[PDB]
Amino acid sequence: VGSLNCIVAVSQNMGIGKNGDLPWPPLRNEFRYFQRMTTTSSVEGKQNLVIMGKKTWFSIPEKNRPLKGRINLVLSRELKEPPQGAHFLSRSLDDALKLTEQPELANKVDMVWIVGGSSVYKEAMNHPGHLKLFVTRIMQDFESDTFFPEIDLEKYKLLPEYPGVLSDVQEEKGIKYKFEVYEKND
Ligand SMILES: NC(=O)c1ccc[n+]([C@@H]2O[C@H](COP(=O)([O-])OP(=O)(O)OC[C@H]3O[C@@H](n4cnc5c(N)ncnc54)[C@H](OP(=O)(O)O)[C@@H]3O)[C@@H](O)[C@H]2O)c1
Ligand SMILES: CCc1nc(N)nc(N)c1OCCCOc1ccccc1C[C@H](C(=O)O)C(F)F
Ligand SMILES: [Cl-]
Structure with missing residues (x-):
């Protein structure tokens, strides 16, 4: 089992x-970026796991x-079995990560x-160990009811470039955005 990553798109007022x-x-290409980043496995024969x-x-x-x-x-913590179409369900992130060490995963x-x-x-973001945050900064305010927690910049480094990730401003439907990658080795 490989690296632990978060991926998110977030507006200027921290909305998701x-x-x-x-x-x-x-935003078609923001979606395509999310799909490609989470689907692409570095190891033949293996798939990535998405936790949500x-x-x-x-x-x-x-x-x-x-x-x-x-x-x-x-x-x-409420569901008794994975929802229709899913095959895995955990009570907590820690339980899910422990599940990745069992043979089936x-x-x-x-x-x-x-x-x-x-x-x-x-x-x-508070889990100990190596962690990367793939954060799309949507450079506009949007009305939101769900928010991304502010990144603890005493714990993370912002990388200027990351392989396969364009570092310049993107624009679709009149909305500019930028792909960022943060890293900690906690
Ligand atoms: N922009 C983006 O990158 C992005 C990404 C994802 C989602 N979204 C948007 O954000 C909204 C969904 O996110 P949300 O924050 O409202 O909800 P959410 O985190 O996806 O779901 C919340 C529920 O999941 C369970 N849960 C969440 N964290 C848990 C944890 N650590 N351990 C155990 N159970 C946990 C709990 O359900 P129980 O009460 O059953 O335990 C909780 O009520 C939607 O509007 C969606 O479109 C946007
Ligand atoms: C592309 C958004 C995104 N971007 C980054 N960078 N990170 C993320 N975690 C992220 O959210 C992915 C999971 C939340 O998805 C949605 C929630 C509400 C409406 C639509 C979707 C997209 C759906 C999907 O996810 O396939 C559907 F289009 F198929
Ligand atoms: Cl932040």
Whole structure:
């Protein structure tokens, strides 16, 4: 099992969600970036694992559930079994990470990607060990009801470039944004 990563897109006012949707209109290449980063495995024969909260799972359209080409895991303390279309369910991020060491997943999983929402990012960002944060900075304010926690810059470094990630400003539908990658070796 490989690296532990978070990936998120966040508006200038720290928003990630609104009424079960994204706060901004759909940004095709931001979606394509999310898909490619979380699907691409560095190891032949293996897939990446995506971990997500329950609300994030249900915010994905049923046609795109589970996220194709990745092993999906949902976090919830209320559900008694993984939701329809999912095969894994854990009570906490720590439980999910321990699950990756059992044979059913250790043989299959390369990278682990936390894909939201708010409380999952919070638990992950404080988790000890090596962690990278792939943060898309959406350079506008959008009305949101779900937010990304502020990054502790005493713990993380901001990398000027990361392989395969363009460092220049992007623009779609009149909205500019930028891909950032943070790292800690805690
Ligand atoms: N912009 C982005 O990058 C991005 C990414 C993801 C989602 N989103 C948006 O954000 C919203 C969803 O995020 P959200 O923060 O509202 O919800 P969420 O974190 O996806 O789901 C929250 C629920 O998941 C369970 N849960 C979450 N963290 C847990 C943890 N660490 N351990 C155990 N259970 C945990 C709990 O369910 P139980 O009560 O059943 O225990 C909790 O009520 C939607 O609007 C979605 O569109 C945006
Ligand atoms: C692309 C957004 C994103 N961008 C970065 N950089 N990181 C993330 N974690 C992230 O959220 C991915 C999970 C939340 O998804 C959604 C939630 C509400 C509405 C639509 C989606 C996208 C769906 C999907 O995810 O496939 C669907 F289009 F299929
Ligand atoms: Cl921040």
